[PDB]
Write a protein that binds this ligand. Sequence first.
Ligand SMILES: O=C(/C=C/c1ccc(O)c(O)c1)O[C@H](Cc1ccc(O)c(O)c1)C(=O)O
Lengths: 168, 168
Amino acid sequence: SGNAKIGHPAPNFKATAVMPDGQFKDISLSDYKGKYVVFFFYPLDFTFVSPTEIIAFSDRAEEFKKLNCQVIGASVDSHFSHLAWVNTPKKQGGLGPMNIPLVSDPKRTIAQDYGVLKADEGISFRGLFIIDDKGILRQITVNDLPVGRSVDETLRLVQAFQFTDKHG
Amino acid sequence: SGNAKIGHPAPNFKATAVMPDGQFKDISLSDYKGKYVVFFFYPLDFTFVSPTEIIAFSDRAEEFKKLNCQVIGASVDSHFSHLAWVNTPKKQGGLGPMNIPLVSDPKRTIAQDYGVLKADEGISFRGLFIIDDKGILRQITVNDLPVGRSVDETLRLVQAFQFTDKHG
Ligand SMILES: O=C(/C=C/c1ccc(O)c(O)c1)O[C@H](Cc1ccc(O)c(O)c1)C(=O)O
């Protein structure tokens, strides 16, 4: 199940995203060749654990930019849903303005390609993938729904892969 | 692809391990039902990223014991190779005495079952799996060969799954 394999090219995708400026744009994983990419899935918009994760990554996007690394979040919700959540203030339980793009995967094909579809519910597990500047998958993380991810740990991994990339 | 699926029983195994007392014993994942298990693969013995991880999990095994959690390491090397590394003095790059068992997977079937065999080389990637006290797989972590895992992160995940098990 899925085509995400360590040491092999990460599965490409082309999807509509809500961009940091608040507007829609169709983006592809291949747009970010030359940069490391952290690509993470969350189950659903308008939930309780996912916003804490999304906001944590968005708040700390600058730490990833200094590592020449693009962060991209994704769920199976529509792109309109993403925009409604961004336009809901954080004070009121929304995401607020974002520093990272949020991809919409409404046909669930990206989640299936990455092997993180919870088939009996049509939603993704908490999958996170680290892809190097050549597009090669370097790291797979999948959490069951109840437990969120750590930005600290993700930064540690990105830094460590970049460090070992310099060896010869 | 393997048979390790979030929310499903983690694949059972029965394999020879070198135990903390330095003796060989055949153990099974099902021996630890009723406790959380952290089951991690490392690629080969007598290497220079794996020992940092193994020694860290061994050194801090009491923190997992406080969480009622058993840590188990594994590689495709023979159990004789495992013990030779344990018996190598730490000052010469050895593991030293271990607080955790080290499973031998010489047929590569356990790595295949867990979807972490690097097929063109016959060794495992750095897979780590968190399995709950009912035997259900809760978390999947797979790193490419160059980059090690974090005990802190593993403890964070084990504790968080146990907390959400009780309330949520
Ligand atoms: O000993 C090492 C060191 C890996 C490493 C350490 C630093 C680097 O910058 C880098 O590119 C690779 O890895 C081995 C795993 C391994 C086994 C076989 C290989 O052909 C391999 O490339 C790595 C281990 O720790 O078990």
